[PDB]
Amino acid sequence: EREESYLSSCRRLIQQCTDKYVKQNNAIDIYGTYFPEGPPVEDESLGTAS
Amino acid sequence: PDGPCNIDTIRQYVTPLNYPLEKMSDMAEEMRAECKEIVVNAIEKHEDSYELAARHIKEQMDKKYGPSWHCVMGEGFGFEISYEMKHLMYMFHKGYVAIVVFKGL
Amino acid sequence: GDIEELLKQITNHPGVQGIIIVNTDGIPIRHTFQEHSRLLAVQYSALFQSLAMKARNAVLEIDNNNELLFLRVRTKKHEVLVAPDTKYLLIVIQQVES
């Protein structure tokens, strides 16, 4: 962690990049789906009496 | 602490699989029965030192079947060995541990 | 000095715990890890370093005037971001919000 000095520059560049991407990732979800499951199923109490 | 970054969560996932298992073998019936017994007993005997478990394994193995045996532990690795048939052993145990035992050529 | 302060600024964000800096020698020292987690540190460092090596090889093979900048990958339960450098590598781990 001592040997040289562009350690700081490298971590700064990489870290600002990772910061903005994790920032926007945390901002809003990107992979959900509306109503992924659960169309109702009814067999005994049928919707008709035929 | 909870969730990722903790070994305990992965261990909880892989916990209830604590008994030996394998299905790939050609080597003779009494002799892989004895081999599986000796390796599981050595695993139970030595928990800290995989080296010392390998010691105890290979000492019984070669004292009871002559010289020219080899054996390696692991929980992640790969291998490729030339060998004579009826002599290859490759077992899983603990849910994450693998073993091979074989004859030199 | 201020590098740990920047790291804690990063960790202030919701739903994040884990940052790894990897050098050329493969020694993974920069971590939000407790005592027990050297094994997982070695895990992530070695595997992601190999992945980044192959990724950058693929990039310079597919084009000689392009240079890889960033990578993420998903699971059903997790998120992980990785960023390469000419000498170093950064890995951060993020958790899915409901």
Next chain:
Amino acid sequence: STDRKAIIKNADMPEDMQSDAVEVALQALEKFNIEKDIAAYIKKEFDKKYQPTWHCIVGRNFGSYVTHETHSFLYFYFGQVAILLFKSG
């Protein structure tokens, strides 16, 4: 992030053999993707050039012990992925 450095400390073979193993492992890791075919490539190349039987164990962690003949042992690792190689015959 450019390449991987060599770490060698246990050796029973001359420096030419050690170096030959070094560039063999470098070529294998560079060109190939999986430790499967890395080990396969290094084993077949060494068997072709210097006669059977070579045996190699490639991995992430393992504890090994083998019986090897004269001048048949080396301990050379690149990064945190590791390779052991020996004569047995």
Next chain:
Amino acid sequence: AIIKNADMPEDMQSDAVEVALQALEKFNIEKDIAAYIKKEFDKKYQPTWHCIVGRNFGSYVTHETHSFLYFYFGQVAILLFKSG
């Protein structure tokens, strides 16, 4: 057992098996094991017998009948023929 060549009685096949196994269990030097086999076999049933020890080889010998045997264990091969 891997026993495919024999001009022995069954008891001779047997005690040949135990003497060879016990010699192999003791020693690893071919001189030492062949020494045990020849001298002990001579002790038991008189001159002149000869055993041959080797992992790979070629031999073509002469003997009286009921006085020849050939057998294996693992990677060692044993001839046993009478002459003299």
Next chain:
Amino acid sequence: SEIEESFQRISQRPNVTGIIVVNNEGTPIRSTIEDTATQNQYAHLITALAAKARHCVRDLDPTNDICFLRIRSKKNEIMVAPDKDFTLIVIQRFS
């Protein structure tokens, strides 16, 4: 159908003209890129990378599965959607 509608939608927009579907065997399927050599090399390299990504995820955790990847570069961008039966790859170019 709706598949065709969404596909033409993804294709028609500028700075995005490339979509390839790769089967389990690695043989290319219905595609839009023109150059055969470019298509072949793209498919081979990206499927190799996707297999390594599945390697990574499964090695890190056995009961955790993977469906996503992308590559971000200084001029190009790669969309990778792996699946048990196919792999969908999309090409993006920045201005």
Next chain:
Amino acid sequence: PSATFSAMATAWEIYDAYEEDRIQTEKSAAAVQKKTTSGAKTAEEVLSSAAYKHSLKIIERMVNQNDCHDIIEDFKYWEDESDLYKEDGNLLPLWQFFTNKVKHRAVTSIALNNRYKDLFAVGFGSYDFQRQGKGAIHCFTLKNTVPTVPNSPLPAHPEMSFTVSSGVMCLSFHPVETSLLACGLYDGSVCVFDLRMHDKPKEEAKQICQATVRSGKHTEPVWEVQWCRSTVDLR
């Protein structure tokens, strides 16, 4: 005689080996209990796979959303600094939505879903007394924002879309069961949708029911509807 062998040892290999053992043990147990008691898919099938359309939806949504990278950032993370000093208020425009299918008509309704923060229903109709005609209902989501470059508007796609014989200006989500949506018609009737059914495209995907004159249809256009907080009966 000699032979060679190679194998790989890794976590998923151990895991799925043990798992397959679990399934085959369960199968053997089930077979014992029963005895005691008594090629690759074609390219057409790959194209027709539902996983394929799932992947297409996700990937088009992502390419749109990383086209729109900065505007989401100033949507959620922007803070006005001048307001600390200046006293009165200000506004900032964020996004615009329109489709090519709803041209020459007005947009009059907005409803919000309780379970999802980023979904809203959009009802179309005309308040001109002479331009009455058919009506449309659509469902827009904040997952699919599009850049509004000046002198070049680009339309977006509703996730859910339905059409109906008359203009609609009524939208009522049921508050706790987040799928039932009631709406009305200019002609004097109402109909209800349950947009859970939108997964299946196998038919035209009608509404549940619509009122008839024998059922009690109203004689004038209707624009206001509201559910009741009850689950024993739907009202």
